[PDB]
Ligand binder design. Structure first.
Ligand code: CLA
Ligand code: CLA
Ligand code: CLA
Ligand code: CLA
Ligand code: CLA
Ligand code: CLA
Ligand code: CLA
Ligand SMILES: CCCCCCCCCCCCCCCCCC(=O)OC[C@H](CO[C@@H]1O[C@H](CO)[C@H](O)[C@H](O)[C@H]1O)OC(=O)CCCCCCCCCCCCCCCCC
Ligand SMILES: CCCCCCCCCCCCCCCC(=O)OC[C@H](COP(=O)(O)OC[C@@H](O)CO)OC(=O)CCCCCCCCCCCCCCC
Ligand SMILES: CC1=C(/C=C/C(C)=C/C=C/C(C)=C/C=C/C=C(C)/C=C/C=C(C)/C=C/C2=C(C)CCCC2(C)C)C(C)(C)CCC1
Ligand SMILES: CC1=C(/C=C/C(C)=C\C=C\C(C)=C\C=C\C=C(C)\C=C\C=C(C)\C=C\C2=C(C)CCCC2(C)C)C(C)(C)CCC1
Ligand code: NA
Lengths: 449, 32, 44, 48, 35, 145, 30, 37, 187, 48, 238, 99
């Protein structure tokens, strides 16, 4: 690298010393790609190594084998793991890719070209070459459209991915006739983020998910061709600040936004995040409390439709804020729940008490592992459930853990966005290093009073 | 057990590789 | 029913729109500010 | 009836009630009649 | 009763439109510095 | 009133556990001669063999106003257990001073509170005036030296 | 009389804050 | 678990996650070895 | 005290989670997660152990002098538990009520019988085994599980009674309660 | 995700539950949870 | 919305629209009413939703009047999912009797002026005697709360303190209404019905009702008021 | 002055005030602990307990906090104060519903 006195930046700002060195930027970036792929491959190897096949696969502290299993790679009808070789081969391919990526990264950091445009005009860039920035965006957006269409190929032509909503308790299903229509996809993206609908955590079916992936892949590919074949407009070039620091701020704000989104995804979804592979979400295990208790006391002999609780609303059933009958526990805040074992028990108008009395199914009944243990409690130091629960079980819900890690780190990335937003705006103005000490804006404008 | 012994020797080999690299680059010239 | 309620809570309403007049006045307000800004753009 | 307002030293309340206000935010009416809706113009509302 | 909703939605879109076009409207040049 | 003496149904002397200074509210439990729990005013009032109406305790008294009228049936035994749980049972008139019911502080407590607070505040005053006296040169002025 | 006492002290302190914000002494020495 | 052909390498597998954390720490060794230039 | 060294590489001597107890002609494996409590609900209780976490999870035994020679002389097990329907706790509220929900009129608590057995261990005397789910209008712990093993040896009935709330019963005290139930032996 | 759950953490050779400052805090916390929502719970575990 | 077309809608379409609160109606049936074939019926699915909530109050001048109110309760007021029977003859006398179902609903309403009046909209243990045009009876009215309900001082009935925990020097013959009684004696109310829009082919009757029931007694401290409920009900005969 | 309305104009006053606030706060809280040394506590709001006693319908977060303090006392002092021999049974220890 280089020193402070010539770069102007201290060691704790040294990664900015390579702002104007595109080759070193490439070296650091390819090395980072190696780091990410290396962690992915390593963790997939561990989650293969620490596997107990007879138990349900969420109590072993495994976060990304659910990522492979959501693709249906070795998943039984009810959700049985069956085989671990796809997870193993995924981890090893990631590790080899990590080795080649890391070698390329260290090569471009050390012996790679120090500056790129003198030999490769296709790879060199000053940070005001707005046309070539748009070209780079076009390339990356084409890549993202290719990845989305890859998920399309898996869902429609490779016979994979698990649907939790198949009858009997779900099934790995090759998706036929996905819903790609603009009305449902855009209404899915422009609705409220609260419990009435949920903005982006509202996708109840994988035809809707895959149709959204149709839309995102097509849009990214067409916008990639657009960004390749167009030039920034005067309004964009006036409203935006164009520097490598402002680009960091835009990327940081965006990645914080999708980090917050991914946190909420992990916390609430049971469709794109199967509960059978992740553990229950917030509203479930509490819906499971109410469901197990209702079936148990209607089994003993006590009625539940005429059963009234301590507060006048119902110990086992009440009416929702809307005119539908919902479960009577304290899970009445979670009346908007949709999990694979309630729709066969869901009636149009009400909960269909005669269906509850007679048409109960034993898969629904045996869906009590979500109830008894595994609720999204779990403490910082494992232990059992609530903060008073004692050292009896070793469990924490991966939904909780990769929700809180993601939202915390997304908040820190929001802070980083704020930092580089302000510094980029101030540097493009000209006072990143302070006020000029002789002609301040303060002395040039009027006093307040 | 033998598993723990292998775990520890692999741990030592992977932790000592980095400082070995920086010391080798410090004593075999520079440009680090 | 004992009272007249909006009854639009939930149901997947885009932007919370339940009647077309609200979407029309949203578009009208944004277009009005846009027309003012566009005609009064370039400072002068 | 037997504990009327003028027995309580009510000085400014009779002058309030002489032109229309009879009930407050307390859900009571000085005549004892069943509480209606004052609107903004109650004893305490007019006071504020 | 939806009249309140229409009024508040109109004023919210008005304030948001002021924000959106205010930052669209050559905001980084609103600086005393040489930039 | 006197000393509230509590007997079980078969006959044995139970003692009320007294309320220590730290507790704003303490449970009322009638415990055995040795120190075993025999009865209590229950919170759940639906389990075990400690509720008064089934244990069968009777309150006797041996004092000034109340000396020989023994109560066993009504909630009067619970009321006197609550009263004797504070110590000796006394009659108080609360209408003369429009008295409230919560426990006030002693003049000793008011004296000691005020004078501990004043002693610590005057510790601040002493340390400040000691600072000012020792450091009179730098509090007033040193004139660029 | 209880509630108007609290209301008066709260709005009075808010009034002193308002008066100190907009009708303060103009600042001198920097 | 790993398959039968890869079972003896599992202890060698069992030390990987700390290596990325050792990378930033190696960067700290680098920055101290160049004496914080 | 006497000076003896630390336990390094010396393993652990207790992993089953049960400690033995020998008494006046009775033996049972009391839980090591539980500690004794001198809470004599009935005056005939001779031994009692309670959980340090939640004392509702508690066990006790009695030695009640009797006249019947064998437990079969007590008749049917239902008529036996109808005789012992006073260790469950009688309600202190006599007020009229119907709004409890799923319970009898003017009642607060109810007990559900969930098991009967006449198991045999070493000599031939039958062990009356019961499992009672105690449901209350309070709903505390989601209910309580009452497991009772009662036999008479010479002239004293030895009645085991381990208590377990329905919450901790599902959490995993089922194994320990069943262990105490199968370990309550009278020799 | 809570904090540290250090209850039941110290045991002796016989496996007895050996009380700790963490157990003091634990009993205080559960005495806090018992009045938390006196009548709004119908079911034993608190999840919703 | 007749029950036939309600079953054909998915659970998402009804969700958030409040049509589940609406009781099914009859459009293809007749209004002959007396045409219905006598005998014994074992019907199911008593649907019962209100339309108004007016509360009786007592002036201190001596006359009887009602007044409209405003609901603080949202859509939790209908009754859905009971079963029962009536024994009908040729002339028209019935033996209407419900058995079991969602025969209660927690509701809170305020009179003009701002006084909380919560009530449990119950129809349980209703005996129905009379003609199809007008048959009435009495139904059991529970208190409102269970005996395990706690006041904010922690006192109560079946469970609690039933003593002045907040102030230890107040247990005389003044808090008897607040501490000693704690009554949960269930009251009784009268509901008069009427059968309209009778169906011949599948046996569906959907009429209106007017029900007099007392309000909540809370903890027995203050006497209950009378609330009359007007609405529409529904049932399918089998 | 344009963000918060009021701003510091003399750094002597600024630094004296940032010396003043923690010392003042610690001294006042020290006087509070001096008050608690003699079991003088700000526990009851007599109007609030009187009106909550005569009306079972009125409640506050304060009333919830007082009852919750009783819960802390009852469930904690039993082992927290070993010299008190507090063998209080579970049915006199107070609960909510279902917990
Ligand atoms: C995401 C981690 C990361 C990455 C990828 C980089 C990457 C880079 N940094 Mg940087 N840095 C980092 C973190 C990182 N840094 C942190 C946390 C700090 C704060 C202490 C710094 C502070 C810093 C400063 C002050 C400087 C850099 C500089 C550089 C650039 C040149 C470094 C160089 O040539 O010297 C060589 C580095 C070494 C000899 C030590 C690393 C040892 C080897 C190369 C890697 C480890 C071995 C590995 C197994 C090899 C893989 C082999 C493969 C076959 C598998 C480079 C592209 C310089 C720069 O800005 O360029 C002008 C510069 O001066 N960094
Ligand atoms: C992450 C990838 C990416 C990135 C970084 C960019 C970046 C950019 N694009 Mg671009 N684009 C992309 C993907 C991307 N695009 C894709 C996939 C398509 C195909 C559909 C397009 C098609 C496209 C067109 C046609 C244009 C741009 C333009 C621009 C430039 C101006 C930005 C702007 O319009 O201001 C901000 C925009 C707004 C404030 C108004 C947006 C309207 C709303 C927000 C969208 C409606 C959805 C919904 C209501 C939003 C709510 C949800 C949300 C909160 C998450 C900018 C540098 C302009 C350009 O090319 O400059 C020359 C241009 O006109 N893009
Ligand atoms: C210490 C840092 C750290 C770590 C360890 C993780 C770890 C993880 N993150 Mg994460 N993240 C981080 C920082 C970190 N993150 C930060 C700072 C942010 C910004 C706030 C984010 C934002 C973020 C988001 C938005 C998401 C994650 C997600 C994840 C999880 C899955 C990773 C993944 O698949 O990515 C994605 C990998 C790629 C995009 C590149 C590969 C392209 C795909 C995989 C190709 C498709 C192949 C196909 C499916 C299989 C092949 C089949 C064949 C036919 C071709 C994972 C456990 C995801 C999650 O929440 O779990 C669902 C997710 O959505 N993170
Ligand atoms: C992918 C996102 C990203 C990127 C590319 C950059 C890039 C850059 N940042 Mg930046 N930053 C980011 C995110 C990012 N930042 C975030 C999220 C924050 C908020 C925390 C900041 C806050 C920040 C500050 C305050 C500064 C920079 C600076 C810089 C520049 C020099 C970096 C350097 O050499 O420092 C050296 C690197 C280190 C000393 C390593 C830091 C080690 C951290 C503190 C330990 C924590 C790691 C731990 C395992 C994670 C814990 C988990 C978490 C939940 C807490 C550089 C171009 C500097 C600058 O302004 O230059 C112009 C600078 O002053 N950044
Ligand atoms: C002309 C206006 C007027 C009138 C007609 C009344 C009339 C009344 N007031 Mg009222 N009051 C007034 C103005 C008035 N007030 C004002 C301006 C205030 C604000 C300070 C009050 C505050 C007030 C309170 C707090 C109360 C009343 C109350 C009452 C009722 C009880 C009788 C009474 O006043 O006590 C006696 C009347 C007198 C003693 C008359 C005084 C005659 C002269 C002025 C005395 C000479 C003073 C002497 C020169 C100064 C030396 C004093 C020094 C030694 C201390 C009565 C109907 C009571 C009530 O009913 O509650 C609602 C009550 O408690 N008033
Ligand atoms: C928005 C304006 C407004 C309104 C609607 C009210 C309304 C009210 N005030 Mg109020 N008031 C106001 C302003 C207002 N005030 C202002 C600004 C002051 C400060 C000076 C007061 C001070 C005040 C006091 C002290 C009191 C009220 C009171 C009242 C209440 C009863 C009035 C009453 O019956 O007495 C009757 C009013 C009169 C008899 C006024 C008669 C005017 C004389 C006869 C005029 C004579 C000369 C005239 C110029 C000749 C005209 C020539 C002709 C040929 C045209 C009533 C609800 C009373 C109350 O109950 O407290 C709430 C009361 O005690 N007010
Ligand atoms: C008998 C003890 C004693 C005496 C003689 C003094 C004397 C003096 N002190 Mg000092 N001081 C004392 C105790 C004492 N102090 C204590 C206990 C403290 C800790 C709180 C302090 C803290 C203190 C500070 C921080 C300062 C002084 C200062 C001063 C000097 C001028 C201040 C002044 O009096 O103007 C007048 C004082 C006031 C107008 C105060 C306003 C009235 C208060 C807020 C309420 C009064 C309540 C009531 C009337 C009396 C209750 C108090 C009583 C029961 C003890 C002065 C010579 C100043 C100094 O050091 O000079 C450089 C200085 O700033 N003192
Ligand atoms: C920073 C961090 C951000 C992190 C995460 C943010 C995630 C998502 C944010 C957007 C998701 C929702 C998109 C809009 C949809 C929507 O709001 O619907 C509108 C919703 C829906 O409104 C309700 O909808 C119901 C049915 O969905 C019913 O119809 C109700 O009658 C109706 O009122 O109301 C709102 O959410 C209010 C939005 C107000 C937005 C003002 C923002 C101004 C601030 C900044 C402007 C910057 C530009
Ligand atoms: C839309 C804008 C958003 C901001 C609006 C709200 C801002 C509030 C203004 C701060 C309070 C002003 C303090 C007056 C006092 C005041 O202005 O003192 C004056 C002082 C200025 O002193 P100088 O610098 O002039 O002192 C040097 C002189 O000796 C020479 O002239 O202000 C300050 O010390 C800095 C501000 C501290 C602010 C202290 C915070 C007070 C908290 C208030 C809480 C109230 C209770 C709850 C509310 C009921
Ligand atoms: C796949 C998927 C899907 C789909 C999705 C989608 C389709 C999405 C999208 C979306 C979109 C379509 C988006 C867009 C957007 C936009 C944005 C987000 C924006 C922005 C911006 C801003 C914020 C601005 C700022 C500013 C201003 C204010 C002005 C000027 C400039 C500036 C910068 C200053 C679904 C769900 C179906 C299913 C599942 C999954
Ligand atoms: C430049 C720089 C840097 C960075 C660096 C890096 C980032 C590196 C890397 C790299 C990488 C990124 C690497 C990776 C890798 C990988 C590898 C090396 C691998 C491998 C292989 C093998 C051999 C395996 C085997 C196996 C299998 C196949 C499975 C089973 C098991 C086992 C494990 C046996 C730092 C910060 C320091 C400083 C500054 C500058
Ligand atoms: Na409770």
């Amino acid at each position: 690298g280089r020193d402070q006195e010539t770069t102007g930046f201290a060691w704790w700002a040294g990664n900015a010393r390579l702002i104007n060195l595109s080759g070193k930027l490439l070296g650091a970036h390819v090395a980072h790609a190696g780091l990410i792929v290396f962690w992915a491959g390593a963790m997939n190897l561990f989650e293969v190594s620490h596997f107990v096949p007879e138990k349900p696969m969420y109590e072993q502290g495994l976060i990304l084998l659910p990522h492979i299993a959501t693709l249906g790679y070795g998943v039984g009808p009810g959700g049985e793991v069956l085989d671990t070789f796809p997870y193993f081969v995924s981890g090893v391919l990631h590790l080899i890719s990590s080795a080649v990526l890391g070698f390329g990264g260290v090569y471009h950091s050390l012996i790679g070209p120090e500056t790129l445009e003198e030999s490769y005009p296709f790879f060199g860039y000053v940070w005001k070459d707005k046309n070539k920035m748009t070209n780079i965006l076009g390339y990356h957006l084409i890549i993202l459209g290719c990845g989305a269409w890859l998920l399309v190929l898996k869902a429609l032509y490779f016979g994979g991915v698990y649907d939790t909503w198949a009858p009997g308790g779900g099934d790995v299903r090759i998706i036929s006739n996905p819903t790609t229509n603009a009305a449902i996809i855009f209404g899915y993206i422009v609705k409220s983020p609260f419990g009435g609908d949920g903005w982006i955590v509202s996708v109840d079916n994988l035809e809707d998910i895959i149709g959204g992936h149709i839309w995102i892949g097509t849009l990214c590919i067409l916008g990639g061709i657009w960004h390749i074949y167009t030039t920034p407009w005067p309004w964009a070039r006036r409203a935006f600040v164009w520097s490598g620091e402002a680009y960091l701020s835009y990327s940081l704000a965006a990645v914080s936004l999708m980090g917050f989104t991914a946190c909420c995804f992990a916390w609430f979804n049971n469709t794109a995040y199967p509960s059978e592979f992740y553990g229950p979400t917030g509203p479930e295990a509490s819906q499971a409390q109410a469901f197990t208790f209702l079936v148990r006391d209607q089994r003993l002999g006590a009625n539940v439709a005429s059963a009234q609780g301590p507060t006048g609303l119902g110990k086992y059933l009440m009416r929702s804020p809307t005119g539908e009958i919902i479960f009577g526990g304290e899970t009445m805040r979670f009346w908007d729940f949709r999990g694979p074992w309630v729709e066969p028990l869901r009636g149009p108008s009400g909960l269909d008490l005669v269906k509850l009395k007679n048409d109960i199914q034993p898969w629904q009944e045996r869906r009590a592992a979500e109830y008894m243990t595994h609720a999204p409690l779990g403490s910082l130091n494992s232990v059992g459930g609530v903060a008073t629960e004692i050292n009896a079980v070793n469990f924490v819900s991966p939904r909780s853990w990769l929700a809180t890690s993601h939202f915390c780190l997304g908040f820190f990335f929001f802070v980083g966005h704020l930092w580089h937003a302000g510094r980029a705006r101030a540097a493009a103005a000209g006072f990143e290093k302070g006020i000029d000490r002789v002609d301040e804006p303060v002395l040039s404008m009027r006093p307040l009073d | 057990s033998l598993t723990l012994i292998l775990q520890l020797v692999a741990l030592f080999a992977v932790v000592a590789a980095g400082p070995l690299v920086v010391v080798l680059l410090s004593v075999r010239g520079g440009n680090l | 029913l004992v009272d007249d309620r909006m009854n639009g809570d939930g149901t997947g309403l885009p932007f919370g729109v339940n009647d077309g007049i609200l979407g029309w006045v949203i578009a009208g307000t944004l277009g009005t500010i846009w027309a003012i800004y566009f005609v009064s753009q370039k400072d002068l | 009836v037997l504990n009327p307002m003028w027995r309580q030293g009510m000085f400014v309340l009779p002058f309030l009630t002489r032109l229309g206000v009879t009930q407050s935010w307390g859900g009571w009416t000085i005549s004892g009649e069943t509480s209606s809706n004052p609107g903004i113009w109650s004893y305490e509302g007019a006071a504020a | 009763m939806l009249t309140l909703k229409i009024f508040v939605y109109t004023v919210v879109t008005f304030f948001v439109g002021l924000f959106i076009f205010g930052f669209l409207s050559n905001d980084p040049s609103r600086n005393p510095g040489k930039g | 009133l006197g000393h509230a003496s509590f007997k079980d149904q078969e006959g044995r002397e139970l003692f009320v556990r007294r309320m220590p200074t730290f507790f704003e509210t303490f449970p009322v439990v009638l415990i055995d001669k040795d120190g075993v729990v025999r009865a209590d005013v229950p919170f759940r009032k639906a389990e075990s063999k400690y509720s008064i109406e089934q244990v069968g305790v009777s309150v006797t008294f041996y004092g000034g106003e109340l000396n020989g009228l023994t109560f066993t049936d009504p909630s009067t035994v619970k009321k006197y257990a609550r009263k004797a749980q504070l110590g000796e049972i006394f009659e108080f008139d609360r209408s003369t001073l429009q008295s409230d019911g919560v426990f006030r502080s002693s003049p000793r407590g008011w004296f000691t509170f005020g004078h501990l607070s004043f002693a610590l505040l005057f510790f601040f005053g002493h340390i400040w005036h000691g600072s000012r006296t020792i450091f009179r040169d730098v509090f007033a002025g040193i004139d660029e030296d | 009389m209880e509630a108007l006492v609290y209301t008066f002290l709260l709005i009075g302190t808010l009034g002193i804050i308002f008066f100190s914000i907009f009708f303060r002494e103009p600042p001198r020495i920097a | 678990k790993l398959p039968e052909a890869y079972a003896p390498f599992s202890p060698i597998v069992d030390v990987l996650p700390i290596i990325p954390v050792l990378f930033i720490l190696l960067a700290f060794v680098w920055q101290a070895s160049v004496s914080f230039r | 005290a006497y000076g003896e060294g630390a336990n390094v590489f010396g393993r652990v001597t207790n992993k089953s989670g049960f400690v033995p107890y020998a008494g006046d002609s009775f033996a049972l494996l009391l839980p090591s997660k539980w500690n004794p409590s001198d809470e004599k609900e009935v005056d005939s209780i001779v031994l009692r152990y309670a959980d340090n976490f939640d004392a509702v999870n508690n066990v006790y035994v009695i030695a009640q002098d009797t006249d019947k020679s064998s437990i079969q002389d007590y008749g049917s097990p239902e008529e036996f538990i109808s005789q012992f329907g006073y260790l469950l706790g009688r309600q202190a509220w006599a007020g009229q009520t119907v709004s409890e929900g799923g319970f009898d009129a003017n009642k607060v608590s109810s007990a559900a019988l969930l098991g009967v057995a006449t198991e045999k261990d070493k000599k031939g005397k039958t062990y009356y085994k019961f499992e009672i789910l105690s449901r209350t209008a309070d709903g505390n712990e989601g209910g309580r599980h009452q497991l009772v093993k009662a036999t008479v040896s010479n002239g004293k009935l030895y009645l085991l009674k381990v208590q377990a709330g329905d919450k901790r019963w599902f959490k995993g005290t089922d194994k320990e309660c069943l262990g105490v139930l199968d370990s309550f032996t009278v020799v | 995700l809570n904090g540290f759950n250090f209850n039941q953490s110290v045991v002796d050779s016989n496996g007895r539950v050996l009380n700790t400052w963490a157990d003091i805090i634990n009993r205080a916390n559960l005495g806090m949870e018992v009045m938390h929502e006196r009548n709004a719970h119908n079911f034993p575990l608190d999840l919703a | 919305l007749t029950y036939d077309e309600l079953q054909g809608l998915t659970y998402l379409q009804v969700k958030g629209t409040g049509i589940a609160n609406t009781c099914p109606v009859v459009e293809q049936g007749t209004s002959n009413v007396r045409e219905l074939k006598p005998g014994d019926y074992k019907l199911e699915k008593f649907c019962m939703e209100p339309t108004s909530f007016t509360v009786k109050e007592e002036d201190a001048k001596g006359r009887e009047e009602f007044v409209k109110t405003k609901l603080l309760t949202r859509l939790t007021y209908g009754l859905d999912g009971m079963n029962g029977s009536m024994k009908i003859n040729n002339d028209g006398s019935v033996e209407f009797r419900e058995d079991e179902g969602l025969d209660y609903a927690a509701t809170t309403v305020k009179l003009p002026g701002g006084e909380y009046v919560p009530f449990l909209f119950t129809i349980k243990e209703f005996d129905g005697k009379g003609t199809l045009d007008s048959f009435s009876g009495d139904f059991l009215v529970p208190s409102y709360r269970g005996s395990t309900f706690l006041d904010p001082k922690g006192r109560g009935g079946a469970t609690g303190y039933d003593n002045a925990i907040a102030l230890p020097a107040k247990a005389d013959a003044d808090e008897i209404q607040r501490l000693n009684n704690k009554s949960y004696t269930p009251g009784k109310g009268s509901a008069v019905f009427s059968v309209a829009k009778v169906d011949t082919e599948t046996g569906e009757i959907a009429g209106v009702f007017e029900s007099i029931q007392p309000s909540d007694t809370e903890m027995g401290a203050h006497p209950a008021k009378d609330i009359k409920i007007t609405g529409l009900w529904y049932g399918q005969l089998t | 002055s344009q963000i918060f309305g009021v701003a510091f104009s003399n750094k002597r006053w600024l630094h004296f005030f940032m010396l003043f606030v923690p010392v003042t706060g610690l001294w006042m809280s020290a006087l509070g602990v001096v008050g608690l040394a003699l079991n003088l506590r700000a526990y009851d709001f007599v109007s609030q307990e009187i009106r909550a006693a005569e009306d079972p319908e009125f409640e506050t977060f304060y009333t919830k906090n007082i009852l919750l303090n009783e819960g802390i006392r009852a469930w904690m002092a039993a082992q927290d104060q070993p010299h008190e021999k507090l063998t209080l049974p579970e049915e006199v220890l107070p609960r909510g519903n279902a917990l």
